[PDB]
């Protein structure tokens, strides 16, 4: 069950200065980057173009190229359309994609955030506001929904293009998605909380537990998954223990990259 994400972030400083940058993920591996400075989108994998032709892709890019410019002036206008009710600096984010299921089933989304909070989504055949949204946003929504061209285009990308493209992206990048990377573990302690550092493992599902032989230690405190530049995962597990009980306790690791041979390292 994979989730595909296009991520946009635009900042409008004042009435004349702004920028817009984007990035694209399949699950936890990055597929595209589009800088504000760059006139074209970039691939960050060899298989980023999925099963799309060169012509197909170049069409799709040009659409977006136009979009970026349009979108800038539009936000700026929509400010004039509020003011003095609204004011700079303004921060906008959009998250859009489709999440894949068994068979042919998928569900697409387009989610917008104004000034850090989620306010607008595209749903069905038009833009709507979500619960919690400030009322004044109704007027913009009304203008956005006035534009039938845009609506058409957006339904198409969300209904058809996204899934089709991901189904194709999933084939062309299966090697990297199903790639297995073996975790490297080391221990230490700080004034005593003992740490089991795990680093370099892929995919992200992992099982890390402290053991006294076979007694599964319940005082084990798992951290957050942090990334490494080479696109592997780092995690750590801390155990709060009394002085002396260092010798004996060991860290056990379950991962698909090992294949039955569990990492086990003793203090």
């Amino acid at each position, epitope marked *: 069950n994979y989730t595909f994400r296009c991520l946009q972030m635009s900042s409008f400083a004042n009435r004349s200065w702004s920028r817009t940058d984007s990035v694209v993920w399949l699950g936890d591996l990055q597929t595209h980057r589009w800088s504000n400075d760059s006139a074209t989108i970039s691939f960050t994998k060899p298989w980023s173009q999925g099963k799309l032709s060169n012509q197909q892709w170049e069409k799709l890019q040009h659409m977006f190229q*136009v979009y970026r*410019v*349009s979108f800038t*002036r*539009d936000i700026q*206008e*929509l400010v*004039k*359309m509020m*003011s003095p009710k609204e004011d700079y600096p303004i921060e906008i984010q959009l998250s859009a994609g489709c999440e894949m299921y068994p068979g042919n089933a998928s569900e697409s989304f387009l989610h917008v955030a104004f000034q850090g909070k989620y306010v607008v989504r595209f749903w069905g055949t038009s833009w709507q506001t979500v619960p919690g949204a400030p009322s004044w946003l109704d*007027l913009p929504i*009304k*203008v*956005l929904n*006035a*534009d*039938q*061209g*845009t609506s058409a285009t957006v339904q198409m990308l969300l209904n058809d293009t996204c899934p089709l493209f991901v189904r194709g992206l999933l084939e062309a990048g299966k090697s990297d998605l199903e790639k297995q990377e073996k975790p490297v573990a080391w221990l230490s302690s700080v004034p005593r909380q003992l740490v089991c550092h795990v680093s370099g493992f892929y995919p992200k599902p992992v099982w890390v537990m402290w053991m006294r032989g076979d007694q599964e230690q319940q005082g084990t405190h798992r951290g957050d998954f942090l990334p490494n530049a080479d696109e592997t995962w780092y995690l750590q597990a801390t155990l709060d223990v009394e002085a002396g009980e260092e010798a004996g306790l060991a860290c056990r690791v379950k991962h698909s990259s090992l294949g039955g041979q569990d990492i086990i390292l003793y203090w």
Partner: T-cell receptor
Amino acid sequence: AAVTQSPRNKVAVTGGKVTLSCNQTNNHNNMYWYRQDTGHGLRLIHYSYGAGSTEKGDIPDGYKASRPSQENFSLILELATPSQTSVYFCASGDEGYTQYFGPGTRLLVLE
Amino acid sequence: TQVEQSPQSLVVRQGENCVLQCNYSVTPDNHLRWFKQDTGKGLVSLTVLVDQKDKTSNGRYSATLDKDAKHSTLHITATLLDDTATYICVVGDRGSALGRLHFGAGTQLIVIP
């Protein structure tokens, strides 16, 4: 969808003060001031998204605009010059694209 | 001036047909509209074209739009004396109030009675 202008025709003097006025009873949020000159299409001077707002257009220099209310939009030449001799169109419209144009106002600025 | 009209002006005999041209570079190009303007008078809309390859007709007026070519033509069938007017080409860059209109300077027609 009606748009009216007053006056329809006006003679003024360099350095004088002229007010062109536009009235719309369509409850349109949006109103726009343009000027027509030969060898040119309509160019946008000022526009407004609602009461007590004005926005600079493409050629705003020498004009100032005022939106006292939803129904009225005004173009104000404070220090009239011969170059501001033109025909002025006002229009209005809602969230759609269509703009509805007034009948025009001729202005002549003499020395 | 991303909107260019041609011919600049032309003279025809009543009952003849004529064709007027509009070529533009405006991006994007949501819709294109034709206006008739009588001397001294204001702007009467005649037609508005919206699709990628579009055709409209309104009485003796008919028009085509082709967005790939970014080109439009207005045809007047069986001109009458009242057709003596300037014809103006207008291109709007959005399909909402967020757009700006882009005006050609028009083509001057004189029908000879």
